[PDB]
Amino acid sequence: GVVAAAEKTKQGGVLYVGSKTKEGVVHGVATVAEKTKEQVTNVGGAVVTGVTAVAQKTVEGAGSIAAATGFVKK
Amino acid sequence: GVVAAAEKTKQGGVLYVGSKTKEGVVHGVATVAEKTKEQVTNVGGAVVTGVTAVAQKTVEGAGSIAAATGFVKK
Amino acid sequence: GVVAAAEKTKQGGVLYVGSKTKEGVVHGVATVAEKTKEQVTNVGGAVVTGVTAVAQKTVEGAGSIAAATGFVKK
Amino acid sequence: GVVAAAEKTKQGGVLYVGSKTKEGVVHGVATVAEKTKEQVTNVGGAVVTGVTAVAQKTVEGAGSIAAATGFVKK
Amino acid sequence: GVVAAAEKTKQGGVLYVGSKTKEGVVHGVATVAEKTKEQVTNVGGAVVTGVTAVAQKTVEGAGSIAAATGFVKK
Amino acid sequence: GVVAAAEKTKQGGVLYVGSKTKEGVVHGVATVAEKTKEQVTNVGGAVVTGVTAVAQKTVEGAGSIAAATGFVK
Amino acid sequence: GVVAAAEKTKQGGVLYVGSKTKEGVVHGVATVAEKTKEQVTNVGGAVVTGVTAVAQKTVEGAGSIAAATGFVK
Amino acid sequence: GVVAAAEKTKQGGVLYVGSKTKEGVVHGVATVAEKTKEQVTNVGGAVVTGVTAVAQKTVEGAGSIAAATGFVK
Amino acid sequence: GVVAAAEKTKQGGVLYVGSKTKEGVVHGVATVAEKTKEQVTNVGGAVVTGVTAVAQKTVEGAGSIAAATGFVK
Amino acid sequence: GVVAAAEKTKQGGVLYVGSKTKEGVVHGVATVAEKTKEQVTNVGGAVVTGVTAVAQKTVEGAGSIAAATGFVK
């Protein structure tokens, strides 16, 4: 039993960024292996992966993640 | 039993970015293997992967992820 | 039983980006292998993968993902 | 079992950044192995991974993560 | 079992950064191994990993993380 | 004066190479620039640029090179 | 006066290489610039640039190189 | 007076290499600059630049190099 | 003057290398600069730059190098 | 003046190397600068720059190098 559930019910300044780069190299979420079995990646939020990365008011309601890896069980 | 469920019921400034690059190299979500078995990737949110990446008010309601890999079980 | 379900009922400034690049290389969601068995990728949200990427008000209601790989069971 | 649940019900200045780089190299969340079994990554929050990385008002309600790895159980 | 629950019910100056860098190398969360079994990473908050990294009002409500790794039971 | 001269006068085993590659990338003589004025390249001998390169008894008599660049005068 | 001269007169074993590679990247002679004026390259001998490179009895007579760059005068 | 001269007159076992690699990256003679004026490269001998490089009896007679750079006069 | 000269006249066991590598990175002769004026490289001998490099009986007669950089006068 | 000269006239066992390496990084001759004027490199001998480097009977006759940097006058 792997169960997730989400409910979201409702009875409903200045941000300046200035950048100047030369030869940038960026890696975000990485996963490197040799001789593995499972590679599982779940995203319920935000991944902002620029050279200039700006996130405003991003992750704001009712997230749910359920995972179950492995489980030989015999 | 792998179950997900989502419900969303509702009785219903300035952001400046200025950039200047030369030879940018960007990677985002990556998954590298040799001799693996499963590669599972679930996205319920946002992946913003520019050289300039801006996200405003993005992930805002009722997400659900359920995953189950492996399970030899016999 | 691999079940998803989603419901959404409703009883109903300035963003500036200025960019200047020379020879940028961008990747996004990636999955590389040699000698694998399963490669599963599910998107329920958003993947914005420009050189300049802007995402405003994107993922805003009632998503659900249910996944089940592997499961030898014999 | 592996259960997650999230509920969200509601009865509803200046930020300056100026950067100037030359040959920056950035890694965010990384995971390297040789001869592992499981590589699991769950994101319910935010990952901001720039050369200039700005997050404002980002992670603000009702998140839940549940994970279960291994479990030989026989 | 592995349960995680979250609820969030409700009856609802100037910050200057100036940088000037040359040859910067940044790493964030990292996990390097060889001959392991599990590599689990759960993110419920924020990970800001710039050369200049700014976070404001970022992690502000109702998170929950549950995990279970191992459990040989034999 | 840019003068060259070359004279040649004459009054008259086992080699084994076994290779096995996968994904090779080779560069030989290169020259990369941005905003040059002169890019001069002279070859009087041998340039052998294989994935597997074998040279045997190649450059064996009377070579000459004379080069004169620049001279803003 | 850039002068080169060469003269050559003549009044007249097992070698084993075994290689096995994967993911090979080779650079030989390289010259990289940004905002230069002169890039001069002369070869009178041998440039052998394999992944597996073998040279046997290669450079064996009468070589001359004469170069003269610059001279803003 | 940049002069080079060369003369050459004549009155006329086992070698084993065994290699096994994975992920090889080789650079030979390299030159890297930013905002230079002259980049001069003369080869009179041998440049052997493999992942496995073998040179046997290679550079064996009468070489000459002459070079003159700069000279703002 | 920048003068070179070379003359060469003649009135006329077992070697074993066994290698095994993983993730090899080799540089040889290198030159790196920023905001230079002259970069000169002369090779009159041998440059052997492998991951497995073997040179046998290589540099064996009558070499000469001359060089003159600068000279603002 | 910058002169060189070379003459070479003539009136005419077992070696075993075994290597085992993993994650190996080798450098050789290097010259790294920022805001220099001249960078000169002459080779009249041998530069053997492997992960496994072997040089047998290599440098054996009549070399000469001359160099003159500077002379502001």
XYZ file of C-alpha atoms in Angstrom:
735
model
C 0.000 0.000 0.000
C 1.682 3.131 -1.351
C -0.837 5.950 -0.946
C -0.637 9.683 -1.463
C -3.403 12.265 -1.132
C -3.666 16.021 -1.404
C -6.509 18.430 -0.703
C -6.505 22.186 -1.177
C -9.822 23.899 -0.513
C -10.514 27.575 -0.247
C -13.546 29.823 0.216
C -11.809 32.750 -1.467
C 7.615 45.598 -3.830
C 10.638 45.652 -6.154
C 12.923 42.718 -6.990
C 15.947 43.646 -9.113
C 18.549 41.142 -10.341
C 21.481 42.216 -12.500
C 24.177 39.738 -13.533
C 27.213 39.672 -15.816
C 29.118 36.413 -16.309
C 31.814 34.942 -18.566
C 32.141 31.147 -18.997
C 29.763 29.734 -16.408
C 29.068 26.006 -16.027
C 26.065 24.923 -13.928
C 24.741 21.530 -12.831
C 21.503 21.126 -10.897
C 20.207 17.855 -9.509
C 22.562 15.079 -10.614
C 22.703 11.299 -10.236
C 25.722 9.301 -11.434
C 26.129 5.570 -11.015
C 27.727 2.423 -12.386
C 26.146 -1.000 -11.727
C 23.082 0.077 -9.759
C 19.517 -1.246 -9.763
C 16.970 1.566 -9.339
C 17.229 5.269 -10.080
C 14.036 7.023 -8.965
C 13.471 10.777 -9.092
C 10.228 12.436 -7.992
C 9.630 16.179 -8.283
C 6.663 17.743 -6.533
C 8.282 21.125 -5.966
C 10.404 23.377 -8.143
C 13.824 22.967 -9.738
C 15.128 26.309 -11.062
C 18.500 25.776 -12.736
C 19.733 28.801 -14.683
C 22.954 30.719 -14.731
C 20.756 33.376 -13.178
C 17.937 31.540 -11.405
C 15.088 33.518 -9.816
C 12.149 31.894 -8.019
C 9.342 33.993 -6.542
C 6.218 32.728 -4.706
C 6.752 29.298 -6.182
C 5.777 26.262 -4.074
C 2.572 27.158 -2.296
C 0.031 24.400 -1.785
C -0.853 20.795 -0.970
C 1.926 18.534 -2.180
C 2.308 14.843 -1.472
C 4.996 12.291 -2.394
C 5.018 8.593 -1.530
C 7.795 6.251 -2.632
C 8.781 2.629 -1.965
C 11.851 1.103 -3.647
C 13.603 -2.183 -2.943
C 11.386 -4.648 -1.025
C 12.744 -8.115 -1.789
C 10.148 -9.625 0.599
C 10.858 -13.292 -0.288
C -2.092 -0.914 -4.313
C -0.449 2.247 -5.652
C -2.976 5.070 -5.261
C -2.795 8.809 -5.764
C -5.583 11.366 -5.407
C -5.916 15.122 -5.645
C -8.742 17.557 -4.926
C -8.864 21.315 -5.380
C -12.224 22.994 -4.794
C -12.719 26.703 -4.510
C -15.839 28.834 -4.065
C -14.204 31.865 -5.674
C 5.079 44.875 -7.976
C 8.127 44.870 -10.262
C 10.401 41.938 -11.121
C 13.409 42.959 -13.225
C 16.035 40.508 -14.507
C 18.987 41.712 -16.578
C 21.673 39.298 -17.777
C 24.745 39.259 -20.012
C 26.634 35.988 -20.530
C 29.349 34.526 -22.755
C 29.681 30.729 -23.167
C 27.300 29.354 -20.564
C 26.725 25.607 -20.251
C 23.760 24.399 -18.174
C 22.485 20.975 -17.150
C 19.275 20.446 -15.207
C 17.950 17.174 -13.860
C 20.331 14.435 -15.014
C 20.461 10.672 -14.494
C 23.483 8.755 -15.810
C 24.027 5.039 -15.386
C 25.728 1.993 -16.848
C 24.197 -1.450 -16.185
C 21.122 -0.394 -14.235
C 17.623 -1.885 -14.201
C 14.988 0.839 -13.744
C 15.103 4.564 -14.407
C 11.881 6.259 -13.277
C 11.312 10.014 -13.383
C 8.053 11.655 -12.306
C 7.394 15.389 -12.576
C 4.417 16.924 -10.811
C 5.939 20.349 -10.215
C 8.077 22.557 -12.420
C 11.529 22.235 -13.970
C 12.747 25.612 -15.285
C 16.143 25.150 -16.929
C 17.317 28.169 -18.917
C 20.494 30.169 -18.907
C 18.253 32.786 -17.359
C 15.452 30.922 -15.595
C 12.610 32.889 -13.979
C 9.677 31.240 -12.200
C 6.852 33.315 -10.722
C 3.788 31.920 -8.880
C 4.307 28.492 -10.384
C 3.358 25.448 -8.283
C 0.140 26.295 -6.494
C -2.314 23.451 -6.044
C -3.142 19.840 -5.220
C -0.319 17.622 -6.416
C 0.069 13.924 -5.736
C 2.788 11.403 -6.659
C 2.860 7.713 -5.788
C 5.664 5.429 -6.943
C 6.730 1.819 -6.322
C 9.756 0.254 -8.050
C 11.525 -3.019 -7.320
C 9.363 -5.578 -5.463
C 10.788 -8.999 -6.299
C 8.249 -10.511 -3.863
C 8.739 -14.182 -4.890
C -4.430 -1.658 -8.707
C -2.485 1.355 -9.985
C -5.004 4.180 -9.640
C -4.860 7.939 -10.090
C -7.682 10.438 -9.601
C -8.007 14.207 -9.770
C -10.850 16.663 -9.193
C -11.121 20.430 -9.533
C -14.447 22.195 -8.980
C -14.915 25.931 -8.770
C -18.047 27.981 -8.061
C -16.676 31.190 -9.563
C 2.480 44.269 -12.101
C 5.566 44.221 -14.334
C 7.824 41.307 -15.267
C 10.864 42.276 -17.343
C 13.570 39.938 -18.664
C 16.479 41.261 -20.719
C 19.123 38.803 -21.901
C 22.178 38.795 -24.168
C 24.132 35.560 -24.688
C 26.864 34.266 -26.996
C 27.081 30.487 -27.582
C 25.104 28.953 -24.744
C 24.404 25.224 -24.502
C 21.462 24.011 -22.387
C 20.107 20.596 -21.449
C 17.013 19.782 -19.414
C 15.614 16.515 -18.118
C 18.036 13.795 -19.254
C 18.269 10.026 -18.788
C 21.317 8.165 -20.131
C 22.054 4.466 -19.749
C 23.743 1.460 -21.291
C 22.199 -1.989 -20.672
C 19.095 -1.001 -18.723
C 15.661 -2.644 -18.577
C 12.976 0.043 -18.093
C 13.048 3.788 -18.726
C 9.807 5.469 -17.619
C 9.220 9.228 -17.614
C 5.921 10.829 -16.599
C 5.187 14.554 -16.777
C 2.182 16.023 -15.004
C 3.623 19.480 -14.432
C 5.800 21.639 -16.653
C 9.279 21.490 -18.189
C 10.454 24.867 -19.545
C 13.881 24.444 -21.155
C 14.851 27.507 -23.178
C 18.022 29.508 -23.288
C 15.918 32.140 -21.572
C 13.009 30.425 -19.814
C 10.157 32.313 -18.127
C 7.296 30.505 -16.375
C 4.464 32.595 -14.923
C 1.387 31.072 -13.203
C 1.978 27.628 -14.664
C 0.982 24.613 -12.549
C -2.205 25.551 -10.744
C -4.586 22.653 -10.282
C -5.372 19.073 -9.345
C -2.724 16.737 -10.718
C -2.088 13.093 -9.922
C 0.551 10.495 -10.916
C 0.673 6.788 -10.063
C 3.507 4.619 -11.369
C 4.623 1.028 -10.736
C 7.640 -0.544 -12.464
C 9.509 -3.751 -11.680
C 7.318 -6.318 -9.876
C 8.747 -9.726 -10.761
C 6.380 -11.559 -8.360
C 7.012 -15.081 -9.713
C 2.389 1.083 4.636
C 3.880 4.126 2.935
C 1.274 6.871 3.307
C 1.562 10.601 2.796
C -1.181 13.176 3.197
C -1.450 16.922 2.824
C -4.274 19.341 3.580
C -4.505 23.078 3.047
C -7.784 24.886 3.697
C -8.219 28.607 3.941
C -11.078 31.087 4.377
C -9.304 33.823 2.434
C 10.173 46.557 0.114
C 13.232 46.464 -2.157
C 15.471 43.477 -2.899
C 18.513 44.357 -5.013
C 21.084 41.809 -6.204
C 23.957 42.818 -8.466
C 26.660 40.306 -9.390
C 29.708 40.284 -11.660
C 31.537 36.970 -12.091
C 34.200 35.456 -14.350
C 34.525 31.663 -14.759
C 32.246 30.268 -12.079
C 31.429 26.554 -11.790
C 28.418 25.449 -9.712
C 27.055 22.079 -8.576
C 23.788 21.796 -6.676
C 22.511 18.535 -5.270
C 24.783 15.704 -6.404
C 24.904 11.955 -5.802
C 27.762 9.799 -7.115
C 28.204 6.074 -6.645
C 29.826 2.935 -8.005
C 28.078 -0.399 -7.310
C 25.095 0.797 -5.299
C 21.545 -0.562 -5.412
C 19.024 2.268 -4.966
C 19.344 5.963 -5.744
C 16.156 7.758 -4.669
C 15.625 11.516 -4.764
C 12.385 13.185 -3.671
C 11.884 16.943 -3.984
C 8.975 18.617 -2.233
C 10.616 21.993 -1.670
C 12.742 24.155 -3.931
C 16.162 23.717 -5.529
C 17.531 27.031 -6.848
C 20.904 26.437 -8.508
C 22.145 29.473 -10.423
C 25.418 31.284 -10.531
C 23.239 33.982 -9.013
C 20.418 32.132 -7.248
C 17.607 34.161 -5.644
C 14.550 32.681 -3.913
C 11.801 34.829 -2.395
C 8.680 33.650 -0.497
C 9.151 30.226 -2.008
C 8.156 27.215 0.123
C 4.947 28.132 1.893
C 2.465 25.363 2.555
C 1.379 21.794 3.270
C 4.058 19.435 2.018
C 4.514 15.777 2.839
C 7.141 13.178 1.876
C 7.194 9.478 2.715
C 9.960 7.099 1.666
C 10.782 3.443 2.346
C 13.937 1.856 0.927
C 15.520 -1.558 1.430
C 13.235 -3.928 3.395
C 14.579 -7.404 2.659
C 11.998 -8.820 5.120
C 12.773 -12.518 4.446
C 4.329 1.990 9.012
C 5.837 5.010 7.284
C 3.217 7.762 7.554
C 3.645 11.490 7.068
C 0.860 14.027 7.406
C 0.740 17.784 7.082
C -1.998 20.329 7.726
C -2.122 24.060 7.194
C -5.558 25.530 7.843
C -5.982 29.250 8.312
C -8.649 31.954 8.657
C -6.713 34.451 6.545
C 12.860 47.481 3.807
C 15.803 47.388 1.395
C 18.058 44.333 1.115
C 21.105 45.056 -1.057
C 23.594 42.449 -2.309
C 26.597 43.439 -4.411
C 29.225 40.929 -5.531
C 32.286 40.901 -7.778
C 33.886 37.473 -8.168
C 36.508 35.800 -10.376
C 37.152 32.020 -10.477
C 34.620 30.680 -8.006
C 33.721 27.000 -7.648
C 30.665 26.068 -5.558
C 29.319 22.701 -4.445
C 26.130 22.209 -2.468
C 24.664 18.993 -1.121
C 26.843 16.095 -2.254
C 26.974 12.379 -1.518
C 29.859 10.415 -3.045
C 30.228 6.703 -2.398
C 31.562 3.393 -3.701
C 30.079 -0.027 -2.831
C 27.055 1.191 -0.903
C 23.439 0.016 -0.966
C 21.134 3.024 -0.654
C 21.429 6.709 -1.457
C 18.248 8.517 -0.407
C 17.792 12.282 -0.483
C 14.559 13.964 0.603
C 14.144 17.736 0.304
C 11.274 19.466 2.069
C 12.869 22.888 2.444
C 14.987 25.054 0.178
C 18.444 24.473 -1.308
C 19.914 27.720 -2.681
C 23.300 27.040 -4.287
C 24.572 30.067 -6.198
C 27.887 31.801 -6.310
C 25.718 34.543 -4.833
C 22.806 32.785 -3.119
C 19.999 34.855 -1.564
C 16.887 33.485 0.157
C 14.161 35.675 1.667
C 11.013 34.579 3.582
C 11.557 31.201 2.007
C 10.487 28.196 4.110
C 7.307 29.182 5.914
C 4.823 26.397 6.570
C 3.726 22.864 7.386
C 6.271 20.347 6.171
C 6.660 16.677 7.005
C 9.277 14.079 6.034
C 9.279 10.385 6.922
C 11.834 7.808 5.821
C 12.801 4.193 6.529
C 15.993 2.647 5.136
C 17.243 -0.859 5.883
C 14.908 -3.264 7.756
C 16.567 -6.608 7.048
C 14.093 -8.529 9.296
C 15.872 -11.889 8.920
C 65.260 37.631 -48.999
C 63.352 34.501 -47.993
C 65.423 31.791 -49.671
C 65.372 28.024 -49.287
C 67.519 25.388 -50.955
C 67.759 21.620 -50.665
C 70.038 19.213 -52.530
C 70.182 15.425 -52.423
C 72.730 13.330 -54.319
C 73.420 9.610 -54.317
C 76.019 7.699 -56.330
C 74.983 4.061 -56.014
C 62.185 -7.532 -39.365
C 58.587 -7.708 -38.141
C 56.406 -4.781 -37.053
C 53.017 -5.672 -35.549
C 50.313 -3.232 -34.394
C 47.058 -4.628 -33.021
C 44.434 -2.195 -31.741
C 40.846 -2.473 -30.519
C 39.175 0.836 -29.678
C 35.665 2.161 -28.989
C 34.841 5.910 -29.124
C 38.115 7.599 -30.010
C 38.479 11.301 -30.863
C 41.789 12.551 -32.284
C 43.104 15.999 -33.151
C 46.419 16.494 -34.907
C 47.958 19.862 -35.604
C 45.445 22.571 -34.720
C 45.372 26.355 -34.548
C 42.378 28.183 -33.062
C 42.082 31.949 -32.802
C 39.793 34.986 -32.702
C 40.930 38.289 -34.296
C 44.217 37.157 -35.845
C 46.223 38.907 -38.561
C 48.315 36.061 -40.035
C 47.905 32.281 -39.733
C 50.741 30.475 -41.548
C 51.309 26.710 -41.537
C 54.042 24.892 -43.478
C 54.601 21.134 -43.656
C 57.875 19.765 -44.985
C 57.770 16.433 -43.180
C 54.988 14.034 -42.277
C 51.797 14.540 -40.260
C 50.245 11.122 -39.538
C 46.936 11.454 -37.680
C 45.038 8.175 -37.587
C 43.156 6.568 -34.809
C 45.970 4.061 -35.181
C 48.967 5.804 -36.747
C 52.044 3.910 -37.972
C 55.015 5.642 -39.612
C 58.009 3.724 -40.979
C 61.072 5.171 -42.782
C 59.250 8.343 -43.784
C 61.283 11.563 -43.596
C 64.634 10.688 -45.109
C 66.216 13.405 -47.189
C 67.038 17.040 -47.865
C 64.258 19.255 -46.567
C 64.212 23.003 -46.078
C 61.715 25.610 -44.812
C 62.096 29.396 -44.721
C 59.330 31.619 -43.362
C 59.209 35.369 -42.734
C 56.002 36.959 -41.427
C 55.088 40.278 -39.856
C 57.458 43.092 -40.918
C 55.435 46.229 -40.244
C 58.503 48.144 -41.549
C 67.940 37.509 -44.821
C 65.979 34.388 -43.901
C 67.969 31.595 -45.539
C 67.718 27.837 -45.155
C 69.929 25.264 -46.826
C 70.220 21.502 -46.667
C 72.465 18.975 -48.398
C 72.453 15.193 -48.246
C 74.758 12.907 -50.226
C 75.342 9.189 -49.998
C 77.795 7.442 -52.322
C 76.591 3.970 -51.358
C 64.188 -7.525 -34.872
C 60.582 -7.722 -33.688
C 58.454 -4.754 -32.617
C 55.044 -5.598 -31.145
C 52.359 -3.156 -29.965
C 49.051 -4.452 -28.628
C 46.453 -2.008 -27.328
C 42.861 -2.165 -26.092
C 41.113 1.095 -25.200
C 37.671 2.631 -24.643
C 36.865 6.390 -24.574
C 40.104 7.865 -25.889
C 40.632 11.582 -26.533
C 43.978 12.728 -27.947
C 45.309 16.176 -28.787
C 48.629 16.579 -30.565
C 50.198 19.948 -31.240
C 47.723 22.687 -30.320
C 47.830 26.470 -30.368
C 44.883 28.388 -28.901
C 44.619 32.160 -28.744
C 42.247 35.121 -28.532
C 43.314 38.485 -30.027
C 46.748 37.553 -31.366
C 48.687 38.857 -34.380
C 50.816 36.052 -35.855
C 50.419 32.283 -35.553
C 53.238 30.482 -37.388
C 53.718 26.714 -37.389
C 56.447 24.849 -39.282
C 56.920 21.080 -39.423
C 60.185 19.672 -40.745
C 60.139 16.429 -38.787
C 57.279 14.088 -38.000
C 54.092 14.586 -35.993
C 52.526 11.184 -35.228
C 49.222 11.547 -33.386
C 47.277 8.302 -33.136
C 45.415 6.798 -30.284
C 48.117 4.192 -30.791
C 51.092 5.951 -32.387
C 54.153 4.034 -33.629
C 57.170 5.644 -35.314
C 60.119 3.575 -36.560
C 63.315 4.881 -38.251
C 61.566 8.125 -39.033
C 63.602 11.359 -39.158
C 66.934 10.630 -40.799
C 68.428 13.379 -42.907
C 69.308 16.994 -43.620
C 66.607 19.208 -42.161
C 66.585 22.960 -41.767
C 64.015 25.506 -40.546
C 64.501 29.273 -40.520
C 61.778 31.542 -39.159
C 61.684 35.291 -38.495
C 58.526 36.965 -37.168
C 57.751 40.374 -35.714
C 60.220 43.105 -36.772
C 58.210 46.266 -36.176
C 61.283 48.208 -37.431
C 70.759 37.276 -40.795
C 68.631 34.299 -39.769
C 70.390 31.390 -41.482
C 70.176 27.660 -40.940
C 72.308 25.077 -42.689
C 72.499 21.315 -42.482
C 74.783 18.765 -44.119
C 74.714 14.985 -44.095
C 77.074 12.812 -46.136
C 77.801 9.123 -45.797
C 80.115 6.826 -47.759
C 78.230 3.654 -46.869
C 66.128 -7.696 -30.358
C 62.509 -7.806 -29.200
C 60.421 -4.804 -28.146
C 56.987 -5.562 -26.682
C 54.335 -3.072 -25.530
C 51.027 -4.340 -24.168
C 48.425 -1.883 -22.892
C 44.850 -1.943 -21.592
C 43.083 1.310 -20.705
C 39.671 2.913 -20.182
C 38.956 6.694 -20.213
C 42.225 8.123 -21.518
C 42.780 11.831 -22.171
C 46.152 12.920 -23.582
C 47.556 16.325 -24.478
C 50.882 16.656 -26.256
C 52.599 19.946 -26.937
C 50.084 22.667 -26.088
C 50.112 26.441 -26.153
C 47.313 28.572 -24.665
C 47.155 32.351 -24.559
C 44.859 35.365 -24.428
C 45.995 38.720 -25.876
C 49.415 37.781 -27.227
C 51.360 38.990 -30.272
C 53.394 36.093 -31.699
C 52.895 32.343 -31.348
C 55.669 30.452 -33.152
C 56.133 26.682 -33.187
C 58.900 24.855 -35.054
C 59.207 21.070 -35.116
C 62.464 19.611 -36.386
C 62.361 16.372 -34.436
C 59.564 13.956 -33.645
C 56.362 14.563 -31.689
C 54.727 11.210 -30.865
C 51.424 11.653 -29.035
C 49.425 8.446 -28.648
C 47.602 6.839 -25.811
C 50.302 4.271 -26.462
C 53.273 6.050 -28.034
C 56.325 4.132 -29.291
C 59.357 5.747 -30.945
C 62.263 3.614 -32.180
C 65.483 4.885 -33.849
C 63.683 8.097 -34.664
C 65.751 11.306 -34.761
C 69.090 10.484 -36.343
C 70.665 13.147 -38.495
C 71.614 16.728 -39.263
C 68.888 18.988 -37.932
C 68.860 22.737 -37.558
C 66.387 25.345 -36.265
C 66.830 29.115 -36.279
C 64.235 31.557 -34.972
C 64.137 35.295 -34.267
C 61.013 36.982 -32.879
C 60.330 40.468 -31.565
C 62.923 43.071 -32.631
C 61.098 46.370 -32.181
C 64.283 48.063 -33.519
C 73.037 37.012 -36.553
C 70.950 34.068 -35.359
C 72.889 31.262 -37.022
C 72.649 27.494 -36.731
C 74.713 24.692 -38.278
C 74.923 20.909 -38.092
C 77.041 18.238 -39.785
C 77.009 14.462 -39.461
C 79.328 12.234 -41.502
C 80.099 8.548 -41.293
C 82.482 6.507 -43.439
C 80.865 3.250 -42.355
C 68.114 -7.750 -25.956
C 64.518 -7.844 -24.723
C 62.400 -4.840 -23.734
C 58.954 -5.472 -22.243
C 56.323 -2.969 -21.082
C 52.980 -4.188 -19.761
C 50.462 -1.626 -18.519
C 46.899 -1.594 -17.182
C 45.178 1.694 -16.328
C 41.761 3.272 -15.688
C 40.990 7.026 -15.962
C 44.325 8.419 -17.115
C 44.893 12.118 -17.809
C 48.293 13.108 -19.218
C 49.766 16.454 -20.189
C 53.150 16.898 -21.824
C 54.939 20.110 -22.657
C 52.487 22.878 -21.765
C 52.502 26.669 -21.858
C 49.674 28.811 -20.450
C 49.569 32.589 -20.342
C 47.342 35.659 -20.182
C 48.509 38.970 -21.712
C 51.922 37.908 -22.987
C 53.825 39.068 -26.070
C 55.914 36.215 -27.521
C 55.445 32.460 -27.160
C 58.119 30.424 -28.957
C 58.533 26.648 -28.950
C 61.316 24.807 -30.776
C 61.590 21.020 -30.851
C 64.878 19.602 -32.079
C 64.659 16.380 -30.108
C 61.822 14.019 -29.292
C 58.602 14.598 -27.357
C 56.967 11.249 -26.530
C 53.710 11.832 -24.672
C 51.617 8.679 -24.295
C 49.741 7.115 -21.467
C 52.316 4.408 -22.100
C 55.347 6.121 -23.648
C 58.438 4.268 -24.913
C 61.458 5.885 -26.582
C 64.356 3.693 -27.730
C 67.629 4.835 -29.385
C 65.885 8.056 -30.262
C 68.008 11.235 -30.313
C 71.326 10.362 -31.917
C 72.945 13.000 -34.078
C 73.899 16.575 -34.917
C 71.183 18.867 -33.625
C 71.221 22.624 -33.256
C 68.764 25.252 -32.003
C 69.181 29.013 -31.998
C 66.690 31.561 -30.689
C 66.611 35.308 -30.065
C 63.470 36.960 -28.681
C 62.946 40.494 -27.425
C 65.641 42.954 -28.596
C 63.884 46.301 -28.252
C 67.130 48.064 -29.370
C 75.437 37.128 -32.415
C 73.489 34.057 -31.316
C 75.352 31.174 -32.970
C 75.146 27.425 -32.497
C 77.033 24.510 -34.042
C 77.190 20.732 -33.938
C 79.401 18.110 -35.574
C 79.214 14.347 -35.250
C 81.609 12.286 -37.356
C 82.418 8.620 -36.970
C 84.757 6.395 -38.984
C 82.938 3.200 -38.032
C 69.930 -7.590 -21.551
C 66.279 -7.846 -20.508
C 64.278 -4.864 -19.245
C 60.802 -5.460 -17.806
C 58.187 -2.891 -16.742
C 54.832 -3.856 -15.235
C 52.212 -1.274 -14.272
C 48.759 -1.286 -12.690
C 47.122 2.111 -12.187
C 43.683 3.607 -11.514
C 42.779 7.339 -11.678
C 46.208 8.657 -12.650
C 47.062 12.254 -13.577
C 50.502 13.124 -14.992
C 51.949 16.489 -15.980
C 55.298 17.196 -17.599
C 57.061 20.402 -18.571
C 54.777 23.335 -17.780
C 55.029 27.116 -17.825
C 52.032 29.035 -16.466
C 51.979 32.819 -16.225
C 49.773 35.909 -16.195
C 50.982 39.240 -17.660
C 54.424 38.130 -18.815
C 56.405 39.172 -21.897
C 58.236 36.172 -23.377
C 57.793 32.427 -22.979
C 60.491 30.431 -24.778
C 60.898 26.656 -24.710
C 63.640 24.769 -26.545
C 63.956 20.982 -26.565
C 67.183 19.415 -27.783
C 66.870 16.301 -25.663
C 63.976 13.966 -24.998
C 60.782 14.594 -23.031
C 59.129 11.253 -22.197
C 55.903 11.961 -20.327
C 53.711 8.879 -19.919
C 51.833 7.308 -17.076
C 54.369 4.553 -17.743
C 57.400 6.237 -19.333
C 60.469 4.313 -20.552
C 63.516 5.823 -22.275
C 66.348 3.505 -23.341
C 69.623 4.585 -25.032
C 67.923 7.825 -25.917
C 70.093 10.968 -26.072
C 73.447 10.093 -27.612
C 75.025 12.724 -29.823
C 76.077 16.286 -30.569
C 73.401 18.674 -29.375
C 73.518 22.439 -29.055
C 71.075 25.107 -27.859
C 71.611 28.863 -27.869
C 69.116 31.462 -26.691
C 69.023 35.209 -26.038
C 65.969 36.782 -24.385
C 65.635 40.457 -23.501
C 68.215 43.024 -24.727
C 66.320 46.201 -23.894
C 69.387 48.302 -24.925
